[PDB]
Amino acid sequence: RPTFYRQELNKTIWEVPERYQNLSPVGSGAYGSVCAAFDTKTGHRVAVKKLSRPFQSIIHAKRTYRELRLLKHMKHENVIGLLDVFTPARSLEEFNDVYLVTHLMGADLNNIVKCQKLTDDHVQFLIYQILRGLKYIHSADIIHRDLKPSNLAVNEDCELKILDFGLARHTDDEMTGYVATRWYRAPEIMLNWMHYNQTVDIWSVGCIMAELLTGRTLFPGTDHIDQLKLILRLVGTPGAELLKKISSESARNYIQSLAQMPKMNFANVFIGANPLAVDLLEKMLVLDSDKRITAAQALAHAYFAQYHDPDDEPVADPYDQSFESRDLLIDEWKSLTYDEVISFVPPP
Ligand SMILES: CN1[C@@H]2CC[C@H]1C[C@@H](N)C2
Ligand SMILES: [Cl-]
Ligand SMILES: [Cl-]
Ligand SMILES: [Cl-]
Ligand SMILES: [Cl-]
Ligand SMILES: [Cl-]
Ligand SMILES: [Mg+2]
Numbered sequence: 001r002p003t004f005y006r007q008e009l010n011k012t013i014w015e016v017p018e019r020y021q022n023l024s025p026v027g028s029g030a031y032g033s034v035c036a037a038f039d040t041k042t043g044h045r046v047a048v049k050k051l052s053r054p055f056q057s058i059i060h061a062k063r064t065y066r067e068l069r070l071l072k073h074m075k076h077e078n079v080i081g082l083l084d085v086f087t088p089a090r091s092l093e094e095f096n097d098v099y100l101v102t103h104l105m106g107a108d109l110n111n112i113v114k115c116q117k118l119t120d121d122h123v124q125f126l127i128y129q130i131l132r133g134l135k136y137i138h139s140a141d142i143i144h145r146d147l148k149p150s151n152l153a154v155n156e157d158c159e160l161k162i163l164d165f166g167l168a169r170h171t172d173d174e175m176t177g178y179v180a181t182r183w184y185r186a187p188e189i190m191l192n193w194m195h196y197n198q199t200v201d202i203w204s205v206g207c208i209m210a211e212l213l214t215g216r217t218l219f220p221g222t223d224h225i226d227q228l229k230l231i232l233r234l235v236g237t238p239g240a241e242l243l244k245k246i247s248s249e250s251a252r253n254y255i256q257s258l259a260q261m262p263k264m265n266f267a268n269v270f271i272g273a274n275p276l277a278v279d280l281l282e283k284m285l286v287l288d289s290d291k292r293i294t295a296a297q298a299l300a301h302a303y304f305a306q307y308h309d310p311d312d313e314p315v316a317d318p319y320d321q322s323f324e325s326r327d328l329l330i331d332e333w334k335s336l337t338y339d340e341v342i343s344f345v346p347p348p
Contacts, residue, residue, distance in 0.1 A: 004088045009035060012050065015088040016099065020048060031169070036104055039083070045104040046083060054098050054337075061333035064098060065323065067167055068340050071100065073140065073319055078133030080153075080163040085344045092338050105153035105163065112154040113212075120274050121306070122158055123212045128307045129160040130205055134295040137162070138198045139315035146170070147204035148184040149211075178222045184208065187231050188289055190224060193246045199289035202298070206284030213273050235287050236263035242288045276303040
């Protein structure tokens with residue numbers, strides 16, 4: 001057990017191993033507080049996140065367990081990894097606090113687009129890395145559910161990592177109105193049409209790729225209905241085949257109230273883009289999720305010929321998510337989490 005030391009950072013007690021020095025506040029959503037630190041064992045600048053109220057309810061205790069399980073599994077060059085996890089507690093009986101440690105991300109996509117100009121070669125490389133990471137995530141039957149530019153870290157060398165997996169977090173207020181929290185979401189999840197699956201993430205990649213190409217948000221809707229009208233103007237209104245897959249009767253009646261529109265010509269929307277980029281966008285931005293291109297199929301598209309290496313696009317170890325259907329008490333979720341903290345093995 002390392003020695004721990006205590007300090008107060010903005011109204012909060014932090015108790016951390018001596019290896020972590022020069023702690024300085026950076027952020028605080030409703031799920032925790034974050035400090036930057038120097039890790040003297042590894043030489044890395046790191047983010048240290050102290051969870052808030054991790055075991056306050058069954059829903060919160062299960063979310064804490066879910067996040068720790070997911071971060072411990074993800075071992076890929078284009079996905080955020082877990083450097084360390086710790087608690088100052090010396091037993092389950094005194095266990096209350098969880099701290100998560102990752103590499104400090106110095107810039108998101110948004111920061112890079114504002115400070116540098118990108119060529120078509122940059123966009124090939126950025127979208128290639130998102131798809132390489134998604135091939136790995138989907139191979140474990142994990143859905144990210146919240147891909148958007150603020151959830152993509154990018155460095156000076158244009159190297160990219162996916163972060164901030166969807167933990168079933170987002171509230172109704174957060175998704176309301178003229179908000180980037182909704183502009184990258186597939187229409188079947190935005191409107192609760194049907195049981196969604198991993199295809200929702202490919203829609204988000206199409207929206208991100210379009211905005212790297214034009215410099216404009218693809219579907220900047222002022223609300224859910226405005227956004228659906230922008231989507232159907234580009235891709236066309238649904239055919240009988242998709243309408244049958246929409247499980248809500250009211251959702252089906254509403255769509256049938258809209259005048260029919262054909263799919264637009266994507267070469268006339270993405271004026272002057274690489275024809276291979278136009279073709280790949282037409283294969284991602286398909287209304288019927290059954291017919292979208294997959295991450296593994298997209299890596300073999302000719303747009304990525306300069307970067308594709310089928311011997312360097314790895315898949316994940318199997319991931320057991322049977323806990324998602326399990327009914328447990330707060331203290332049972334808390335014990336499972338404690339065991340996962342004490343069994344952590346750091347990366348090479
Ligand atoms: C001018 N637009 C702003 C920032 C870049 C671009 C696309 C969206 N992310 C919003
Ligand atoms: Cl230490
Ligand atoms: Cl990482
Ligand atoms: Cl504790
Ligand atoms: Cl964003
Ligand atoms: Cl597993
Ligand atoms: Mg985020």
